[PDB]
Structure formats: C-alpha cells, structure tokens
Amino acid sequence: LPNITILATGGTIAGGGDSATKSNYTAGKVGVENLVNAVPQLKDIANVKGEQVVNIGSQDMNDDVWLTLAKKINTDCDKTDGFVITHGTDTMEETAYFLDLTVKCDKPVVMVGAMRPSTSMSADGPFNLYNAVVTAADKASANRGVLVVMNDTVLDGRDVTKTNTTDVATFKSVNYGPLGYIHNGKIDYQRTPARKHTSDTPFDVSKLNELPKVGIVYNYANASDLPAKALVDAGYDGIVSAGVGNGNLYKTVFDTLATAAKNGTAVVRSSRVPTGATTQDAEVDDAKYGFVASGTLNPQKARVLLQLALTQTKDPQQIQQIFNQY
Amino acid sequence: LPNITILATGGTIAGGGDSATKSNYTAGKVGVENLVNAVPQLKDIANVKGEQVVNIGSQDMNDDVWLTLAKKINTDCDKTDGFVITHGTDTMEETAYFLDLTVKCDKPVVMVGAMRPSTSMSADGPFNLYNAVVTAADKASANRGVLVVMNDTVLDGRDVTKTNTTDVATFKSVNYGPLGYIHNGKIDYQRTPARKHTSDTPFDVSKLNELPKVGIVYNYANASDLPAKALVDAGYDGIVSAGVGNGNLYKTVFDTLATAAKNGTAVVRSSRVPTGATTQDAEVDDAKYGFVASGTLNPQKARVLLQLALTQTKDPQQIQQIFNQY
Amino acid sequence: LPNITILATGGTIAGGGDSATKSNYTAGKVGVENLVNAVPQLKDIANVKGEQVVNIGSQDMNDDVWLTLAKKINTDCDKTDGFVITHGTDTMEETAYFLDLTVKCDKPVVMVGAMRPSTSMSADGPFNLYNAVVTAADKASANRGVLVVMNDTVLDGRDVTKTNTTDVATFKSVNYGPLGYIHNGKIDYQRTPARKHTSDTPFDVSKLNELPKVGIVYNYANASDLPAKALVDAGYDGIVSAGVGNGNLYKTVFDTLATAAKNGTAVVRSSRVPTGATTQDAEVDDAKYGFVASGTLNPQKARVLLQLALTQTKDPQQIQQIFNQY
Amino acid sequence: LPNITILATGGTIAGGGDSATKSNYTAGKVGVENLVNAVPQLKDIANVKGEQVVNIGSQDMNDDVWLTLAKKINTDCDKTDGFVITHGTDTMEETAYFLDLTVKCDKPVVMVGAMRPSTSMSADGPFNLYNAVVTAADKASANRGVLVVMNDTVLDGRDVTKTNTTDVATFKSVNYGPLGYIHNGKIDYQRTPARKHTSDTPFDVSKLNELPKVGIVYNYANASDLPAKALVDAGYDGIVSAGVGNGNLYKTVFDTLATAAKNGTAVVRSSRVPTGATTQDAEVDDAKYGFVASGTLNPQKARVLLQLALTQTKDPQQIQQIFNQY
Numbered sequence A, B, C, D: 001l002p003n004i005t006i007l008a009t010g011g012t013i014a015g016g017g018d019s020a021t022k023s024n025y026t027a028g029k030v031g032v033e034n035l036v037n038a039v040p041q042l043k044d045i046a047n048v049k050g051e052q053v054v055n056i057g058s059q060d061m062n063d064d065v066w067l068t069l070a071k072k073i074n075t076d077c078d079k080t081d082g083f084v085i086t087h088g089t090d091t092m093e094e095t096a097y098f099l100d101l102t103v104k105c106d107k108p109v110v111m112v113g114a115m116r117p118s119t120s121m122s123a124d125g126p127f128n129l130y131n132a133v134v135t136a137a138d139k140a141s142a143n144r145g146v147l148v149v150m151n152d153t154v155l156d157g158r159d160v161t162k163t164n165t166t167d168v169a170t171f172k173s174v175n176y177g178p179l180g181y182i183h184n185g186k187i188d189y190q191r192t193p194a195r196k197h198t199s200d201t202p203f204d205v206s207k208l209n210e211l212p213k214v215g216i217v218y219n220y221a222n223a224s225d226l227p228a229k230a231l232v233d234a235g236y237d238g239i240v241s242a243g244v245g246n247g248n249l250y251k252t253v254f255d256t257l258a259t260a261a262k263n264g265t266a267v268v269r270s271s272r273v274p275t276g277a278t279t280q281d282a283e284v285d286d287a288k289y290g291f292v293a294s295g296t297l298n299p300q301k302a303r304v305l306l307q308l309a310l311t312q313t314k315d316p317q318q319i320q321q322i323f324n325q326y
C-alpha cells in the first residue's frame, strides 16, 4: 500500500456538534488519530501516518501555519508517497494556493475538509477523507500541483473557491473547471493546470520566518478609504483591492491606492465578482498608476501570490509577469 | 402607448470605446437622448422621456445619487407608466436593492446596463435597453419590486448580483433565480419576490439628506483588524463583515468587532462567498455579541439594508428582524 | 407534533448499497416501518405513519404508480398534516410534476430521495428524509405545489430536474431556482411557483385507470425518423420531440411529425437542451403545422402535461394554452 | 497576416428575419462573403478566404456534411494556417466532436455560431466570428483539438454542449470547463483536453462515403420500446440510450437492447442528464449484457464516437476501451 501522511490542521472535518440534526458546532475539536480511526477502510488503501500540526478553525488560518506546512511537506517529501491535509473550508482555497506555489514535492498533496460537522446526520467528512486518500494514493494525481478533493471532485489549488456558505458541493473551480471526478475510487482525470506550480516556481519559503504584509480592501458604492489608509499608515508591503466589476475602485479608494503605489506599496486590482479575470486594457490604466491586474485570482488568492511576489521583487512590471505565469 | 421615463446615471451602456475590436473604454460619457435615438424601435413600444440624473461610472456610485434617484422616482411616480434606470453594471446590484427598499411607486422600475461599450462589435446595450423598456411597459411587471433586465432575463433587485467580470450573461439571481425570461418582447414571469419591497417597507428617505455610515471589512487568512479599527475610530454607525464561509471572522477582526458591537456599532456578519445565507446558529453566537446575520444578502447588499435599518433602530435584535423580512 | 405520512415507492434512499466504499447496488430493498427506525430524529418533529405503496427503481416508474399515488394523496389528504414520498432520483422530476398537476390536496406533498446508497459512507438519504419531514411539517410549505427536498433545498416540481448523474447536489430548478433553503430545521422561503398547480388545475385522475399514450423522440445530426414513425403507427395519442436547440427537428423527423399532427397525433416541440424555453416565433411555424411549444418543460415533463392535456382536448390551440398556464 | 479559411455550413450566424426586434428568422440564408464583409476588422488580423460548403440549419446536419468537412480540412491543411467553421448552434457540439476525432490537421480548427440572427439588435455573430478568427490565428490554439469559440470562451469540442435554448452564453464545457478566455484579442489558455483527438486517433474517414447507422432512444417513466425496436428492425449498427440518472433504462427498453446487443447491435448507455459520467459499476451490469458506458459523453456525442468505433471494431469490450480513451 502507498504511505500517506495526513497533516491535520482542524476545520469542521475535525468539527464537533451538540447533536446530529442541529447546525451549531466548533471547528478543530477532534484529533487526527480520531479522524483516521473513524474511517477504518483508510487502512486497506494506504499506510496512514497522522500528525496534528494545529487544531484551529480555518477562519483563524495565518502565515505561521502556512510556513509550517510548506516546510513540513518539503522536509518529509522523500519519507512518504503522498500528503493529505485536513483543513477548514473557509480558507482552504487560500492554503491550497499558497502550498501550490511553495511546495517543492511533486508527490500528490491533497487538501480535504467537510461542510457538515462529523457529529451530524449525513456527515460528508468521512467519504471526503476516503476520497482524499484515494486521490493522494493515485500516481495519476502526481505533478498536478496541490489538489482539493471535495464532493467526489479533484480541483486545482489555483482555481478552487468556496462558492456557497453551506452546500456540501460548495467547492468549484469557477473559471476552468475541475481536474477530475472520483467514482468508486477511480479518478477520470481530463485536465491539468497550465500555470506553473510547486517545483516549477521560484518561491522558496524554507528560510522565511514571516511573509510580506498584504491586506485586502473591499469596493462598493460610497466605499470608505479608511481601510486602505489604515494599511498604508501601518506600512503594509502590498494591498489587494476587491474591486467592483473588472477590478474598478471607488474614487477615494483609487486616490489612496494610486498614491500608495507611487510610494512603493504594491497594489493588485482583483474583483469581489466571483468569476472571471480582472484584466488589463479595461477602464484602469495600470501602467500609469503602477497597479497589477490579478487575472482570474480572487482577492484572497491574489494576496497569496502578491505576498510571495514581494519576497523576490517590489517592481510592479515584474509582479504583473508573476501574476501572468503563476 | 405607455409613457416610460428613462433616468440615465451613466455606465458602459453610455460607455465609449477607444474602438470596436479593442476592449478599452470610459463609462458614463454618452447623454440619454443619444441612447434613445440609437434604438428607434423604442418609439413603437413606448412614449419615452429621458432625463440625465448624473453621468458616472457606477464604481463611483454613492449615497447622494441613491437619495436623488429614490426622491425622483417617488415624486414622478404619478407622472409616468414606468421607469428605466440606465446604470453601470459594477454597482447596479447595490442601487437596485436600495431602490427596492425606498421606492414607494409600485409602477415598474427597471434597471439596465451593458457589459460591452456602445462602440463595441456586438454591443449588448441596444437589445438590453429595448427589453428593459418592454419590461417597464408590461402591466405584469408592476408589484414585483425593482427589476434588473440583462441578457433577456428579469431579475429582482434583492438577489441579482454580477457573477462575472466581463461576460454579457454576468447578472444572475444566484440564490433564488430570475422572475422571468423575455422572448420576442413577451415575458414569461413564473416568480415574484417574497421579501417585502417598495411600498411595504417602513423605509422612507424622502426627508433624509445623508444615510448612516456603514463600511465593509474583508476576512481572509491573517486578516488585519486595522480596516475594522479605522471604521470604529471614525465612528461608523455600522460595519458589514465579508466573512469567510458562513459569516466567520478572523480572530482579531472578531475581537475588534465584538467590542464595537457592545459599544453600539451595528455589526452585520455577511460572507465573501458568492451564494448562500450567512445563517444564525453556526459557529458564532450572535445573541451573545449582538451581531446580525445577513442571510442571503452579500456584503454590499447587507450594507444597504443596515444603512436603512439604522434610520429606524440601533437595536441588533430589531436589525435582525429587518434582515429576516426585507 | 404534526401528522406526516411517508408513502414509500423505493429508490436509492431504500437502495441497499453493496457497502460503504461501493456505488454498485440495487434500488428498492427496505420499507417504511424501518425508515422511522433508521432516523429516530423524525420522532422529535413529526408523528410519522409510513405506508409502502410500491417498491421499484424509479427508472421503471409508470402511469399506474402515478395514478395510484395521486388517488392515495387525494383520498388520505384529510387524514394527515402532510405527505413525504420517498422516490428513486431518476424519474423523481416526472412523478413530482405529475403529482403537481393531479393532487387536489394543498397540504405539503414533499418528494425525497438519495443519490448515495443507504450503506455508503456519507449517505445523503437520512438527512434528506429528515429535511423532507421538516418541510412537510412546516405550514409555510402549504399551497406551493408538490415539493422536492434534496441537499437542503426545497424545489418546486415543475422546474426541478436532475442535472448531474452522481452528485448529491444534482437536483436544481434550472430555469427559475428553488423556493427555499433549509438550515437547522428552519426554511427561508423566498419564492412560490406562479404556474397553476394541484387545486387550480382542471386535471382529475380520480376516475382515470389509464393515461394517453405519449412518447418522446430525440433529435441529433442525421436523426432517424423511425422512432417517430413507430409511435405514429402504434397509434400514440401524442409525441414529444426532444429537439435540438430551440425545439428544432431534423428534416425527416419534422416531416413524420407534420403528417402525424395532420392525422390528429398531438405534437409537442421540447428540447434536449437542459435549460431555457422552447418558444414560439423562432424557426418553426407551429400555427401552420399544428405543433405546441413546451416552454421551459423538458421532454419528460412535457410528456406529463401532454398526457393530461389529452384527457380534456385534442385541439393544438387548446394544448398550447394549457402549456402556457401549467 | 496568417491565412484563415472559413468553411461555411450555415446556421443562425448566416440567419435573417424581417426584424431587428422580432425573434422569427430562417437559419443558413446569408452567404460567407456577407459574414466576412460584415466584419471589416477581420482584415487587420487574418487573410481570410471563405468557402460555402452548404447553407443549412444545423438541425439538418448529416453524415455527408461531416465527411465533406473532415476531408476538406485534411486535404487543405497544408494550404492554410487555420480553419474557422461557421455552424448552426443546434448540432455544433456533435460536428465539433466528429471533427475532434477525424481531422488529422493540427492547425487550429475553430467552430463558431451565433444565437441571434445577423439581422437582430445586439447580434452576437460578428464578435463571435472576430474571436473565432483571433483563436484560429493564435499559435497557442494549435494541438488542442477542434475548438468552439462562443461568448469570449474557447471550448474543447469533446466537453462543449448547448446548455440553454436562447442565451448567447449557452455553450459551456459542463464537466471539465473551458480551455481559455478571450479578452481584447488575447487568449488566457489554462487547459488542454487530455483525451486523444485529431492526429492521435486511429479514426480515418478519408476513404469512407458512409458512417455506420447509430440512433438514440430516450428513457422516461413508462417509456415505449417501439423506438428501440424500430431501429433494431431497420438493422441499425448502433443504439445510444439516453438513459435516466446514471444511464439507467426503463424495463422494456432494457429488454429490447439486451436482446439487440446479444444479436450484434452495439449498445451504448448514455444519459438524458446534462452533466456527469454514465459510469460502469453502477446499477447496470454492462459485462453481462455487452453494453458500453458513455462516461461524460451525452447521447448525441456518444453517437459520434460509437459511429467511428464501429468502423474499427464491433467488440463491446474494445468499444468500451475507445469510450475510455477518446
């Protein structure tokens, strides 16, 4: 059997409710040895080793967990056939993309969680975890970057996003679709991501102890500039704008960010709009202001690539090419 | 023929391309008599009168334009058979919802835009504008609230959202679906909104000249609490959290807003996730901290209802009632 | 607690899997008396009486089960507060619409199934059944027509369709969206179908022991007319064309069906295309040929309305009126 | 500039009616010179040669047009830089997959239609044609198989399907998603089909004047077996079942096709259900009956691969291996 390491970080898959039909619970309550033993069939398709890295709700996910996870996987790559990371759904799409750019291991790295607490009727965690291990054990899963396996679907860490607050089917790759579908432990893979990932990226966090400070500001009618101004006064290295439409900024946010960019704050235009690219050549002259367009990266993912971009360069022209290749 | 008043506010429907093949353009620079003459077929279905209220890209939409639009429709209601507002697509969903709560005219009020500039090769604007006027002149359009007509679809102002940065088919009612489909100038209406709108809401902005201050903060991994701190230091009346998953907040944004809530800032838990409700009875005890759950309202829409709720009450229990009925 | 009757017909929610890691199985095995025993929680929300009316895979669903189901509900209406019908997922969308037209009981009639076998890890059935009973027990579910409750969503029987082959989230109301979402045993209803259902239809199967014969022919490049020829020769009362695009027909199929319409076979143009209306005033002159356009009814659902229309009228103009109202 | 051959076959892109505003029209009315002359901007990107192969509605597409199109592309491959095929939307997805398998030219072959006739207000054809020519002229479009370009999207000919009867955005790759998006004449390609196409298929139609006879039968409640019997009685080479759910058959249709397969008719189980795979190891024991499972191929596309499969072999076991590779 392949050797699979489960790195547990918490989430609703480790999530514990008061009853089976009542929606109240706490993420990150159950340990990894209890997750594995709840699904005995795991032991017939893989030699499973668990470690608990942290036990938090992914709403509390942060740079320190991200750095720990990249280093652990890079370090233990040689000692295992594949990794499964149990994680909350809330920021799974962020950790998946971060590991997609930082992991130098091209063994399957699969992230999995659950939308329903382990204590609820029709808990999705068990089958998700089973299918995550199936995916991490498949040689065909190798070299596709960091994968998210939820609801019988293998999704790439770059395009995967939580599209719904409660549905077991919430995770979708809203721009380019999934890599594969799992039926009876077999994966019909018809796609692989084209942007560079894992071992093909220049980002190496092995020596990094902290990442550049990147904040996100929301745009909306009558938007306040206070959020943008607070991040600039705090000396943030980068700001992502969750623009309206094709990455457009409310006038006062535009002014504050246009200024901050002249003073060498990195500014990426992304969109609150869940699907499609924030493009160049629309209503914002990026060249004039030193702004980067995020393409299909949504604000929280844009933050991820900007943080890693700002470990190599502060040049907007170079951050743009980073955003066009990763 | 029915009298239809078109109130122009700008946007890409009044948007001017550098060219037809080229995607570069400026929003809100063509006047309203130019939109009407550009579609002469309107003259056979309606008696169209145009007024220019403003000429802005809707990325710059604000409280003043909203109050003006509401005051104008309420004043002119008995002068016309229907309104069509031309509007930029970027913040159309925010404007439609505001007017859906504040307009006391139960004549059809229809909002329309274009995703491609008028100068573009297969400009969506002419047909949108025709169908908006058709919709505004159908007697069956009355009593459904403020409508958005885009891509042959009638959407209610509450649920409609921009789902894609560039696609002509971007506007979708992502939780509950459209009200109707237009073919050959006929509308198959199979739905009507259940939530109270227009003349069944207590909200009256007719003697208001300013609205309560409500800002939105974004949640993500390692989120800064400075955006939230800046808004409470500036004495914002209300804060909407674009939370992760089912309205969850990052640790420090939590601690900051929980203190703000107990010092009389209205705090609404919404979600960055594009579909589904921020529910009560998940991971956050709203009763303990005095938080309101937005339900299906996305952050920018939750802001609109919070702004209005704060003209009547600052009691969180009552503001939750409002979010459960409007 | 309210009185809820579960009428079992079979399906994957009774479908005993080969096991937990296996999606190979047989639909129809277990019986009503041991549904309330697998889901003890039902006893906290309803006084549940279960009757088995048949035990089949819903791929074998037929006119006889439809008539017995409708007469059952009509007869027992006054003896219960609400009905749940457990059903295979494959033809749920047909039965649901059949009942939606023929049931005269305006108490909740809720259909429910399961996409995963009862033996599967993360089997969906139990929570679906719980939620179906919550929906049947909620007095706000009254007068909305026949309901399908799957994946935490209340769907109307006219628009619900199976969109995916395997996904637990397969059931969507693809044209007009769902009526409500269920969270923590509470339903947020924001819609009700406008089309006439149950009590407001003139269809009465109370005295019918048989239905008109309506078949379905598929269109595609180089479509054979032999399917259409065979149903016309066998004296079928009605043919539903699953056309290409906007209900268009291959020339030789168009030919057979224009002749059949002339010899008094009822012909309904529908579409293989999963979403959108088959409209009048497109490429087919329906007035000329005696054809009816199905609107948003897909081929299967249009079969259901044609069968029932044919019990009142054989006049194309009148069948078209029926198609524009139910 | 590159040499782009447009092979015209007709469709609504070459369709006209009496009105910009009225929906009535005839497909395949306008010649290719009129389409090209309608978009002068073409002259700035390609050296366009147009040939009229046929002028039909794609509802009338047939095996002769398919063979003519495959032979033309194969014969003229070396004389041009890329091909654009103007086609009706109704059976585009069928033709596109036929060519994806039979074309041996690996220059861009791009198909394109319009959902609105050329005479309509906001006609989609012009910009779709511009973008199909941009796609055929882009060197990144080579080696991705036959492409469909619609609504700014580059779609692979295998997964693409028409999802809506009227919407300009109807074409989606519903299982695996699109290959690329077009903004401002630039394609962000992030995917390529992994299933073998064009020059890696063994299928060669260069010597064929006929394709084996394959018909499609539809499954529903109380389905008639006469359509299936009628194709067997006519000695059809192949039958594709449009099954319910995961490729299931009504009892009479099952019996007729079990019988037929026993007697040497190739039987493919597909599904009426628009998304997801018809899988093996579900409720039908395919090995026992000699049935092939379509995977993600819908009925009309399973017909294409079965027709070509039947030119190499009649062994169900080998036809299944083809459905797993192409």
Ligand SMILES: N[C@@H](CC(=O)O)C(=O)O
Residues within 6 Å of the ligand: A010, A011, A012, A013, A027, A028, A056, A057, A058, A059, A087, A088, A089, A090, A091, A113, A114, A115, A116, B245, B248, B283
């Ligand atoms: N708050 C939870 C939600 C989930 O896991 O589904 C988390 O992200 O950890």
Ligand SMILES: N[C@@H](CC(=O)O)C(=O)O
Residues within 6 Å of the ligand: A245, A248, A283, B010, B011, B012, B013, B015, B027, B028, B056, B057, B058, B059, B087, B088, B089, B090, B091, B113, B114, B115, B116
């Ligand atoms: N920025 C433009 C976008 C549009 O109109 O499509 C506006 O919102 O005014």
Ligand SMILES: N[C@@H](CC(=O)O)C(=O)O
Residues within 6 Å of the ligand: C010, C011, C012, C013, C015, C027, C028, C056, C057, C058, C059, C087, C088, C089, C090, C091, C113, C114, C115, C116, D245, D248, D283
């Ligand atoms: N084949 C089953 C499908 C299911 O219930 O999931 C049935 O329709 O009976």
Ligand SMILES: N[C@@H](CC(=O)O)C(=O)O
Residues within 6 Å of the ligand: C245, C248, C283, D010, D011, D012, D013, D027, D028, D056, D057, D058, D059, D087, D088, D089, D090, D091, D113, D114, D115, D116
């Ligand atoms: N019937 C037309 C429809 C279209 O092209 O949109 C065709 O397929 O030729």
